[PDB]
Amino acid sequence: MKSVVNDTDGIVRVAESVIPEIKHQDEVRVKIASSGLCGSDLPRIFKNGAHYYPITLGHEFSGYIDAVGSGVDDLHPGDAVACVPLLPCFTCPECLKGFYSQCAKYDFIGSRRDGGFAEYIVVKRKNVFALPTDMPIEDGAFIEPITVGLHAFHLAQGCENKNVIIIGAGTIGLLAIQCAVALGAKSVTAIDISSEKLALAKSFGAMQTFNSSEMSAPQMQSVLRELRFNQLILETAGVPQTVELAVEIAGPHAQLALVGTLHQDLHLTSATFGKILRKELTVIGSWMNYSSPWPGQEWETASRLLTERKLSLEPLIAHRGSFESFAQAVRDIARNAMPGKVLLIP
Amino acid sequence: MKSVVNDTDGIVRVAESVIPEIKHQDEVRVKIASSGLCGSDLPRIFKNGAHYYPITLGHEFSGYIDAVGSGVDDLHPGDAVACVPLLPCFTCPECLKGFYSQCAKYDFIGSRRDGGFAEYIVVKRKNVFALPTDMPIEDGAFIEPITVGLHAFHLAQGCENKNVIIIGAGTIGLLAIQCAVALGAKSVTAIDISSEKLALAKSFGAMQTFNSSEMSAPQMQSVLRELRFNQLILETAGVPQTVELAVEIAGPHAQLALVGTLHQDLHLTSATFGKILRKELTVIGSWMNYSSPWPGQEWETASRLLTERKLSLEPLIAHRGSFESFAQAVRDIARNAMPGKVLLIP
Ligand code: NI
Ligand code: NI
Ligand code: NI
Ligand SMILES: [Zn+2]
Ligand SMILES: [Zn+2]
């Protein structure tokens, strides 16, 4: 079979390998239909940053059960599934309480072990999530990214009837925008430096957009006046300036979910820090995309939205293609910005 | 009557002045029995932190109603009261929603108007909170400071059965320690650079103490392992280093209430910021000390705790004296830092 492997840095080869076999009673083999590229893979490929090389990445994928171990009885050949890439231990105090993303002894498909840029993959049963027969299998590769946004909403106790503000119009942000609309947010506002990403977000249901290269935080807070109550702000860009921005625009008692990891230090003036207190913000750190019971309601809601077609995936997809097409397109972007979602369709 | 007045650049003097008269129908006059100096008064006195000069400070006081305005029918001369120093407008959107501390046009006794370092004061009916007949009147001057920590607990949906960690062992933090113990925290931990203040904390029922000048954040976290869950951390020191420490030591899904205001900028490393996401912390900005119905359950609870003698005030008190010893004790803070509560007793 084929697979995409990248080595000490840059080089993305397309490889031939022995079909992987089931080696534990709790494993299943998946035949992969759709597998997408993540923002987090770019560093692993083009800035070192991967746990080892050569490696096979890919943790956003769907497909069909091809075989199951002697111990799995609730799955069967033909069953549609999406990959659940994190594997917590399930038995430590964090896991018992449902804090799987704070488990210290973890594996992760496509990072700590090879992933789904491949024709077949063997994973633990725990690492697949059954999908309805009625969901287009290809959209299955979007479930893990969608759950990023839903997990933040879950932590905030839901986006319903709230004035949600999404900061960052990348795939995560844009998926969050569509979910907020589908789940009955009172309003959805999108904030980004690109007027193009913003128009896109507007086409997804954001009733208004703020271009943060043109509009001031005050300017924004001014526009936000009528919707300053019950805010749920999602910071998805992961840069000091947008974390700072979220705090400065925040309405009274706004919830602030951080899903974006920083790679530069955060410098909050005493004034900005003061606004966290003065406004009585609740800042919610969000990690990964899971809850109890495993893998979490986030995965059911995501699956449901996808099956009842409330989401619009095409404008998010930059590339469809098999192993060479995908490899090349991955090489094309390099250390630059990701156009949109790059899908591997074997 | 006498009062204590501060002029520019640390000038402290005791003035003679005419007793205030009721001037609006909803006012009351209070003859003050006990009036304490707050940590936030220090910058107002020594570091040009006051809105105007000269000022009469004092927002932590109790006394008896001396007279009531024509429109007040629920209080009478002789009634024991504590001052509720914040005066929201009660008619803006924030106020209608109980966000009194986010009211944009609020007054504040001892900050935006002259306060209770004086024999008598005229304030609005909404600026006083009736005390029980039994309560020793001096204790009423602690109600306001007690409610600060109670307000952080309230925002965190309570301290019951939580492992609370109070960072900062000044008056505010030490009272929060006592309140946590009385309200049924599973455990209380105190953290401060002063071994002597930690012994004090331990006497108030903090089961263990960490000296932040002898112990690293990692070493603190190691000891906290068994108490890592259901943490409620109050940051009361208001310096960048203790805000950083609270995120660094925090256990999985800890609640961090920020009560201490910063007067320096906060520079957070990406790693530190990273931990807010990774531990899925909830960071709770706390402001002032009120909730609905005005002035809040905080006030009911503070009064009850005092009346049932669950609190220990004496070991928190550094100075008792009338206008001259009080004025001098304030001047002495310049060179001899504020080791405890300074009470003006007229
Ligand atoms: Ni991803
Ligand atoms: Ni800085
Ligand atoms: Ni105070
Ligand atoms: Zn675990
Ligand atoms: Zn108001």
XYZ file of C-alpha atoms and ligand atoms in Angstrom:
697
model
C 0.000 0.000 0.000
C 0.902 3.701 -0.237
C 1.631 6.327 2.446
C 3.081 9.825 2.846
C 6.264 9.981 4.924
C 8.357 13.045 5.737
C 11.949 12.895 7.040
C 14.623 15.114 8.584
C 13.458 18.233 7.311
C 11.323 19.192 4.342
C 11.302 16.069 2.232
C 7.852 14.546 1.667
C 8.102 11.142 -0.020
C 5.300 8.851 -1.202
C 6.019 5.312 -0.024
C 5.202 1.625 -0.634
C 4.696 -0.499 2.495
C 3.258 -3.826 3.696
C -0.448 -3.551 4.548
C -0.477 -3.323 8.358
C -1.958 -6.292 10.234
C -3.923 -6.496 13.496
C -1.536 -7.319 16.376
C -3.667 -6.912 19.491
C -7.126 -8.153 20.431
C -8.318 -4.548 20.800
C -7.267 -3.221 17.403
C -9.171 -2.559 14.188
C -7.916 -1.916 10.666
C -9.396 1.069 8.834
C -9.481 1.550 5.075
C -9.018 5.303 4.768
C -11.368 7.292 2.520
C -10.554 10.867 3.506
C -7.594 12.281 5.405
C -6.814 15.976 5.847
C -3.763 18.138 6.654
C -3.666 20.149 9.909
C -2.036 23.488 10.781
C -0.051 21.596 13.424
C 1.488 19.317 10.786
C 3.245 22.178 8.977
C 5.795 22.621 11.802
C 6.288 18.840 12.040
C 7.143 18.889 8.334
C 8.845 22.250 7.689
C 10.235 23.482 11.020
C 11.370 20.181 12.489
C 8.996 19.950 15.445
C 7.963 16.318 14.849
C 8.681 13.737 17.584
C 10.805 11.658 15.205
C 11.671 11.145 11.528
C 10.951 9.678 9.143
C 7.265 9.864 10.094
C 3.735 9.453 8.740
C 1.441 12.233 9.991
C -2.353 12.576 9.685
C -4.923 12.558 12.491
C -8.006 13.962 10.711
C -9.431 11.010 8.840
C -12.401 8.798 8.149
C -12.940 5.495 6.366
C -14.314 1.987 6.778
C -13.535 -0.800 9.215
C -11.583 -3.385 7.264
C -10.999 -5.941 10.063
C -11.314 -6.115 13.873
C -9.270 -7.778 16.600
C -10.440 -10.868 18.463
C -11.587 -8.651 21.336
C -13.778 -6.159 19.487
C -17.431 -7.145 19.215
C -19.204 -3.821 18.690
C -17.514 -3.060 15.357
C -17.667 -4.873 12.044
C -16.210 -4.796 8.525
C -17.954 -2.067 6.537
C -18.768 0.197 9.498
C -18.024 3.847 8.761
C -15.751 5.487 11.357
C -13.701 8.615 12.003
C -10.335 8.526 13.747
C -10.162 9.679 17.361
C -6.447 10.479 17.441
C -5.693 10.929 21.167
C -5.256 7.739 23.215
C -5.373 8.483 26.957
C -4.604 5.619 29.398
C -8.207 5.650 30.688
C -7.369 4.516 34.221
C -5.508 7.370 35.960
C -7.308 9.887 38.164
C -7.496 12.472 35.345
C -9.095 9.932 32.955
C -11.518 8.569 35.558
C -12.863 12.101 35.981
C -13.035 12.656 32.212
C -9.955 14.868 31.980
C -8.483 12.737 29.155
C -6.618 15.731 27.706
C -4.727 16.105 31.000
C -3.644 12.477 30.952
C 0.169 12.348 31.275
C 0.638 8.919 29.725
C -0.777 9.414 26.232
C -0.350 8.384 22.621
C -1.500 10.421 19.644
C -2.084 9.204 16.091
C -0.082 11.387 13.693
C 2.346 12.789 16.260
C 3.641 10.326 18.835
C 3.005 7.521 16.323
C 2.351 7.344 12.574
C -1.046 8.558 11.289
C -3.597 8.434 8.479
C -1.767 9.636 5.391
C -2.000 6.030 4.207
C -4.287 3.477 2.512
C -4.826 1.425 5.694
C -3.997 1.937 9.321
C -4.295 -0.228 12.420
C -5.350 1.591 15.582
C -6.941 0.722 18.888
C -10.741 0.329 18.802
C -10.715 3.233 21.273
C -9.375 5.377 18.449
C -12.321 5.120 16.091
C -15.782 6.636 16.351
C -18.733 5.003 14.566
C -20.446 7.205 11.966
C -24.001 7.089 10.569
C -24.494 5.310 7.237
C -26.076 8.566 6.034
C -23.021 10.814 6.478
C -20.926 11.277 3.349
C -17.789 9.410 4.421
C -15.455 12.075 3.054
C -16.818 14.755 5.385
C -15.762 12.393 8.161
C -12.267 13.861 7.969
C -13.660 17.156 9.290
C -15.002 15.757 12.562
C -11.821 16.105 14.557
C -11.241 19.740 13.561
C -14.946 20.592 14.109
C -14.700 19.139 17.629
C -11.937 21.634 18.477
C -14.509 24.418 18.367
C -17.267 22.353 19.954
C -15.012 21.409 22.865
C -14.467 25.090 23.590
C -18.237 25.681 23.429
C -18.775 22.700 25.728
C -16.327 24.159 28.257
C -18.267 27.414 28.099
C -21.462 25.471 28.733
C -22.787 26.038 25.203
C -23.025 28.823 22.630
C -26.840 28.899 22.536
C -28.343 32.393 22.694
C -24.886 33.847 23.266
C -23.154 36.581 21.305
C -20.240 34.588 19.982
C -17.156 36.259 18.593
C -14.592 34.145 16.703
C -11.072 35.548 16.451
C -9.054 33.939 13.676
C -10.664 32.915 10.392
C -8.636 29.775 9.738
C -10.212 26.322 9.360
C -10.843 26.036 13.124
C -12.358 29.499 13.384
C -14.487 29.075 10.284
C -15.722 25.706 11.473
C -16.511 27.292 14.852
C -18.463 30.027 13.049
C -20.624 27.494 11.220
C -21.213 25.501 14.408
C -22.256 28.586 16.386
C -24.820 29.435 13.702
C -26.109 25.850 13.545
C -26.365 25.605 17.349
C -28.456 28.750 17.810
C -25.936 31.437 18.825
C -27.782 34.724 19.234
C -25.228 36.379 16.956
C -21.924 35.476 15.344
C -19.124 37.941 14.748
C -15.817 37.134 13.105
C -12.556 39.006 13.497
C -9.462 38.615 11.303
C -6.783 40.594 9.452
C -7.857 39.240 6.040
C -10.885 40.766 4.326
C -11.022 37.610 2.193
C -11.213 35.183 5.102
C -13.771 37.589 6.588
C -16.027 37.567 3.518
C -15.846 33.788 3.723
C -16.833 33.877 7.391
C -19.636 36.263 6.422
C -20.856 33.703 3.874
C -20.933 31.138 6.681
C -23.362 33.105 8.821
C -21.327 35.666 10.744
C -23.736 38.629 10.782
C -20.787 41.036 10.998
C -16.989 41.049 10.638
C -14.239 43.246 12.004
C -10.996 43.651 10.036
C -8.394 43.925 12.808
C -5.906 45.558 10.460
C -8.382 48.412 9.931
C -10.523 48.549 13.069
C -9.374 49.448 16.566
C -10.257 47.386 19.652
C -12.214 50.458 20.870
C -13.745 50.837 17.417
C -14.842 47.204 17.759
C -16.075 47.534 21.307
C -18.073 50.508 20.078
C -19.723 48.459 17.330
C -20.228 45.646 19.844
C -22.123 47.837 22.281
C -25.537 46.434 21.416
C -24.203 42.911 21.763
C -21.916 43.362 24.768
C -23.873 41.002 27.028
C -23.524 37.205 27.190
C -20.483 37.095 24.959
C -18.554 33.936 24.142
C -15.248 34.886 22.557
C -13.139 32.174 20.924
C -9.488 33.027 20.440
C -8.297 30.729 17.659
C -5.415 32.680 16.125
C -2.909 31.962 18.871
C -0.950 35.227 18.763
C -0.293 37.720 21.611
C -2.114 40.492 19.736
C -5.384 38.538 19.422
C -5.326 37.388 23.065
C -4.833 41.056 23.996
C -7.574 42.061 21.515
C -10.105 39.624 23.006
C -9.641 41.172 26.439
C -9.899 44.759 25.198
C -13.116 44.179 23.203
C -14.795 41.994 25.835
C -18.237 42.904 27.087
C -19.155 42.646 30.809
C -18.771 39.063 32.086
C -17.855 37.776 28.623
C -16.573 34.217 28.486
C -13.169 33.920 26.811
C -12.091 30.535 25.459
C -8.464 30.198 24.408
C -7.966 27.477 21.810
C -4.942 29.081 20.182
C -1.478 28.202 21.436
C 1.065 31.048 21.588
C 4.624 30.789 20.284
C 5.557 34.313 21.338
C 5.323 35.696 24.864
C 2.217 37.508 26.027
C 2.680 41.052 27.305
C -0.438 42.402 28.995
C -0.239 46.006 30.164
C -1.436 46.522 33.730
C -4.431 48.204 32.101
C -5.363 45.182 29.959
C -4.890 42.760 32.872
C -7.058 45.167 34.858
C -9.859 44.712 32.312
C -9.908 40.971 32.994
C -10.719 41.902 36.568
C -12.832 45.015 35.881
C -15.021 43.250 33.314
C -15.107 40.065 35.417
C -14.192 37.943 32.427
C -14.019 34.195 32.694
C -11.079 32.957 30.681
C -11.377 29.320 29.699
C -8.299 27.392 28.655
C -9.278 24.753 26.087
C -7.200 21.684 25.258
C -7.752 19.166 22.480
C -11.292 18.024 21.880
C -12.707 15.404 24.222
C -15.008 14.838 27.184
C -16.812 12.111 29.102
C -17.793 9.596 28.226
C -15.036 8.989 25.653
C -14.693 10.531 23.185
C -17.322 13.054 24.231
C -20.549 14.729 23.235
C -18.470 16.909 20.913
C -18.099 13.943 18.534
C -21.844 13.176 18.454
C -22.816 16.841 17.873
C -20.207 17.099 15.087
C -21.394 13.892 13.494
C -25.006 15.090 13.723
C -24.326 18.474 12.138
C -22.482 16.749 9.313
C -25.230 14.186 8.706
C -28.033 16.760 8.692
C -25.921 18.931 6.400
C -25.837 22.115 8.525
C -22.176 22.713 7.666
C -20.571 23.959 4.440
C -17.281 22.194 3.781
C -16.454 22.941 0.126
C -15.248 26.540 0.588
C -12.862 25.189 3.273
C -11.220 22.662 0.995
C -8.162 23.794 -0.953
C -7.149 20.430 -2.373
C -8.433 16.973 -3.219
C -5.967 14.348 -4.415
C -4.305 10.968 -3.976
C -0.724 10.290 -2.871
C 1.327 12.256 -5.431
C -1.181 15.120 -5.734
C -1.337 15.388 -1.921
C 2.437 15.060 -1.423
C 3.089 17.763 -4.005
C 0.510 20.156 -2.559
C 2.080 19.621 0.879
C 5.473 20.471 -0.648
C 3.940 23.514 -2.402
C 3.033 25.331 0.821
C 6.291 24.652 2.736
C 6.982 27.252 5.461
C 4.243 29.533 4.130
C 0.595 29.839 5.153
C -1.958 27.098 4.536
C -4.395 27.975 1.749
C -7.268 25.880 3.108
C -7.863 22.214 3.930
C -5.672 19.733 2.056
C -7.443 16.395 1.716
C -5.860 13.088 0.843
C -8.420 10.945 -0.963
C -6.873 7.525 -1.672
C -15.482 67.169 64.026
C -12.134 65.586 63.206
C -11.110 63.762 60.060
C -7.934 62.428 58.513
C -6.986 64.091 55.243
C -4.208 63.332 52.775
C -2.579 66.014 50.659
C -0.217 65.509 47.714
C 2.934 63.394 48.181
C 2.316 61.608 51.482
C 1.083 64.536 53.597
C -1.072 63.261 56.473
C -2.901 65.567 58.848
C -5.985 65.619 61.061
C -8.482 68.345 60.140
C -11.243 70.133 62.024
C -14.479 70.547 60.091
C -18.229 71.122 60.366
C -20.395 67.979 60.758
C -22.033 67.005 57.452
C -25.803 67.600 57.041
C -28.330 65.419 55.187
C -28.664 67.127 51.788
C -30.869 64.801 49.717
C -33.982 62.803 50.668
C -32.281 59.389 50.411
C -29.241 60.182 52.542
C -28.306 59.045 56.033
C -25.624 60.256 58.420
C -23.288 57.795 60.118
C -21.380 58.402 63.330
C -18.322 56.227 62.746
C -17.083 53.735 65.397
C -14.369 51.841 63.544
C -12.659 52.598 60.245
C -9.806 50.592 58.755
C -7.002 51.296 56.301
C -6.982 49.240 53.084
C -4.000 48.030 51.058
C -5.402 49.921 48.073
C -5.223 53.153 50.127
C -1.423 52.984 50.193
C -0.932 53.961 46.539
C -3.659 56.600 47.100
C -1.597 58.092 49.921
C 2.050 57.633 48.899
C 2.103 57.005 45.156
C -0.309 59.581 43.729
C -3.058 57.006 43.311
C -5.923 59.226 44.498
C -8.481 60.796 42.134
C -7.996 64.252 43.696
C -6.112 65.987 46.511
C -6.603 66.551 49.295
C -8.844 63.559 50.110
C -10.391 61.840 53.066
C -10.067 58.102 52.434
C -11.746 55.242 54.304
C -14.096 52.632 52.761
C -13.947 49.961 55.476
C -16.109 51.269 58.308
C -19.030 50.815 60.651
C -20.949 53.047 63.042
C -24.458 54.091 63.960
C -27.127 55.974 62.047
C -27.288 59.478 63.467
C -29.983 60.831 61.133
C -32.064 59.783 58.107
C -33.271 61.804 55.109
C -36.923 62.501 54.394
C -37.151 59.588 51.957
C -35.677 56.814 54.101
C -38.184 54.755 56.079
C -36.333 51.509 56.775
C -33.546 52.829 59.003
C -33.611 54.870 62.200
C -31.212 56.824 64.405
C -29.255 54.301 66.495
C -29.067 51.485 63.960
C -25.714 49.754 63.546
C -24.480 49.761 59.925
C -21.426 48.908 57.831
C -20.592 51.085 54.852
C -21.199 49.688 51.370
C -18.819 52.062 49.610
C -19.620 51.490 45.915
C -22.639 53.407 44.568
C -23.814 52.085 41.163
C -26.504 54.059 39.250
C -29.033 51.208 39.364
C -30.622 52.155 36.020
C -28.111 51.332 33.289
C -28.194 47.950 31.475
C -25.323 46.535 33.549
C -27.123 47.537 36.738
C -30.481 46.118 35.652
C -28.607 42.828 35.186
C -26.908 42.940 38.585
C -23.479 43.805 37.153
C -23.133 46.637 39.681
C -19.344 46.530 39.516
C -19.494 47.102 35.749
C -21.687 50.159 36.054
C -19.806 52.906 34.148
C -20.960 55.786 36.348
C -20.563 54.540 39.917
C -19.332 56.558 42.899
C -17.083 55.125 45.590
C -16.817 56.274 49.188
C -13.170 56.868 50.078
C -12.026 56.962 46.446
C -14.211 59.043 44.084
C -15.737 60.940 47.014
C -14.494 61.491 50.573
C -14.695 58.453 52.881
C -14.884 57.375 56.507
C -11.636 58.440 58.164
C -13.755 60.857 60.202
C -16.231 61.129 63.088
C -19.315 61.546 60.885
C -20.229 60.956 57.277
C -23.251 61.557 55.006
C -23.910 58.815 52.460
C -26.815 57.326 50.502
C -29.138 54.809 52.138
C -27.820 52.354 49.534
C -24.357 52.961 50.999
C -25.167 51.313 54.334
C -25.868 47.712 55.379
C -27.679 47.028 58.656
C -25.750 45.033 61.276
C -27.179 42.793 64.003
C -27.573 44.342 67.459
C -25.266 41.709 68.929
C -22.256 42.305 66.677
C -19.461 44.184 68.384
C -19.401 47.368 66.317
C -15.659 47.347 65.743
C -15.952 44.090 63.797
C -18.263 45.743 61.244
C -15.260 47.532 59.758
C -14.082 44.113 58.532
C -17.228 43.318 56.606
C -16.123 45.102 53.447
C -12.705 43.380 53.316
C -14.276 39.990 54.153
C -16.647 40.356 51.204
C -13.746 40.712 48.771
C -12.733 37.100 49.194
C -16.346 35.985 49.500
C -16.969 37.637 46.117
C -14.232 35.579 44.476
C -15.766 32.434 46.007
C -19.206 33.495 44.726
C -17.868 33.940 41.209
C -16.363 30.456 41.465
C -19.732 29.041 42.516
C -18.485 28.488 46.067
C -15.470 27.127 47.955
C -17.278 24.147 49.459
C -15.402 20.863 49.121
C -12.699 22.501 47.048
C -8.986 22.591 47.654
C -8.478 26.321 47.993
C -5.084 27.952 47.714
C -4.749 31.551 48.845
C -1.742 33.307 47.316
C -0.839 36.410 49.305
C -1.100 36.523 53.082
C -2.173 40.094 53.734
C -5.492 41.077 55.304
C -7.501 40.169 52.201
C -5.928 36.726 51.796
C -5.923 35.877 55.509
C -9.635 36.636 55.760
C -10.289 34.470 52.694
C -8.392 31.689 54.446
C -10.645 31.978 57.502
C -13.792 32.150 55.370
C -12.785 29.067 53.347
C -12.306 27.072 56.543
C -15.656 28.264 57.937
C -17.556 27.667 54.681
C -16.312 24.088 54.324
C -13.402 24.018 51.878
C -11.947 20.508 51.646
C -8.546 22.030 52.341
C -6.920 25.432 52.544
C -3.362 26.124 51.475
C -1.555 29.435 52.024
C 1.319 30.791 49.948
C 3.481 33.845 50.702
C 7.130 34.886 51.082
C 6.749 35.435 54.835
C 7.194 32.415 57.098
C 5.668 34.483 59.892
C 2.585 35.322 57.844
C 2.331 31.609 56.954
C 2.385 30.603 60.648
C -0.441 33.083 61.079
C -2.268 31.533 58.099
C -1.780 28.105 59.627
C -3.282 29.284 62.900
C -6.371 30.325 60.944
C -6.716 26.810 59.595
C -4.640 26.641 56.439
C -3.652 22.974 56.672
C -0.365 23.629 54.899
C 1.764 26.555 53.827
C 4.244 27.157 51.021
C 6.959 29.820 51.361
C 7.262 31.274 47.842
C 10.777 32.514 48.618
C 12.067 29.072 49.583
C 9.948 26.877 47.278
C 9.802 26.751 43.498
C 6.508 26.438 41.632
C 7.449 22.869 40.613
C 8.141 21.910 44.240
C 4.801 23.348 45.298
C 3.011 21.425 42.545
C 4.702 18.215 43.719
C 3.309 18.598 47.246
C -0.107 19.490 45.845
C -0.404 16.285 43.814
C -2.929 14.754 46.244
C -4.889 17.996 46.244
C -4.511 18.668 42.509
C -8.242 18.262 41.738
C -11.083 20.748 42.382
C -8.715 23.559 43.166
C -9.849 27.121 43.765
C -6.863 29.455 43.762
C -7.163 33.113 44.849
C -4.379 35.419 43.627
C -4.431 38.243 46.182
C -0.871 39.561 45.997
C -1.382 41.518 42.768
C 2.113 41.159 41.335
C 3.157 39.556 38.005
C 5.140 36.834 39.820
C 2.157 35.514 41.822
C -0.116 35.552 38.796
C 2.569 33.497 37.033
C 2.888 31.201 40.086
C -0.843 30.478 40.199
C -0.875 29.188 36.602
C 2.390 27.251 37.100
C 1.266 25.374 40.249
C -2.340 24.865 39.168
C -3.855 21.386 39.070
C -6.074 19.949 36.282
C -9.104 22.151 35.611
C -8.284 24.454 38.551
C -10.293 27.658 39.068
C -8.062 30.737 39.374
C -9.697 33.857 40.779
C -7.738 37.042 40.175
C -8.467 39.477 42.991
C -5.163 41.341 43.185
C -4.805 44.277 40.786
C -1.444 44.727 39.054
C 0.504 47.987 39.020
C 3.184 46.489 36.795
C 2.787 45.028 33.301
C 2.373 41.249 33.060
C 4.832 39.546 30.743
C 3.834 35.875 30.390
C 6.039 33.346 28.600
C 4.362 31.297 25.884
C 4.949 28.184 27.998
C 3.169 29.708 30.993
C 0.290 30.903 28.826
C 0.401 27.425 27.300
C -0.467 25.886 30.684
C -3.749 27.776 30.919
C -4.868 25.884 27.817
C -3.197 22.570 28.717
C -4.599 22.305 32.236
C -7.922 23.681 30.951
C -7.872 26.298 33.712
C -10.800 28.652 34.277
C -9.445 32.084 35.097
C -11.955 34.257 36.852
C -11.502 38.028 36.967
C -12.935 39.335 40.252
C -13.972 42.977 40.741
C -15.134 44.753 43.873
C -17.471 42.743 45.995
C -21.150 42.947 45.122
C -23.956 40.861 43.684
C -27.760 40.920 43.486
C -29.821 41.669 45.305
C -27.702 44.694 46.283
C -25.267 44.586 47.964
C -25.099 40.809 47.675
C -24.992 37.453 49.418
C -21.367 38.314 50.145
C -22.558 40.863 52.686
C -25.146 38.594 54.280
C -22.508 35.892 54.627
C -19.782 38.167 56.058
C -22.171 39.443 58.710
C -23.347 35.940 59.604
C -19.777 34.606 59.835
C -18.855 37.405 62.231
C -21.990 36.978 64.328
C -21.343 33.253 64.791
C -17.704 34.050 65.656
C -16.148 31.833 62.984
C -13.691 34.606 62.153
C -10.607 35.727 64.087
C -10.013 39.440 63.826
C -7.597 40.297 66.626
C -4.474 38.690 65.140
C -5.120 40.723 61.964
C -5.073 44.080 63.760
C -1.814 46.076 63.886
C -2.965 49.395 65.346
C -5.915 50.853 67.191
C -6.055 54.567 67.886
C -7.889 57.844 67.528
C -7.099 60.486 64.928
C -3.534 61.310 66.019
C -2.083 57.812 66.553
C -3.914 56.704 63.422
C -2.520 59.582 61.344
C 0.949 58.747 62.680
C 0.577 55.010 62.082
C -0.253 55.914 58.456
C 2.850 58.145 58.154
C 4.911 55.252 59.561
C 3.944 52.950 56.688
C 6.284 54.962 54.437
C 9.331 53.391 56.105
C 7.647 50.601 58.096
C 5.456 48.568 55.741
C 1.851 47.757 56.703
C 2.184 44.597 58.837
C -1.522 44.372 59.660
C -4.858 46.165 59.923
C -4.721 49.816 60.975
C -7.942 50.891 62.632
C -9.091 54.458 63.248
C -11.195 54.280 66.415
C -12.796 57.743 66.977
Ni -5.487 18.803 14.127
Ni 6.977 42.320 27.835
Ni -10.498 47.798 50.809
Zn -4.977 8.669 31.939
Zn -25.379 51.590 36.516
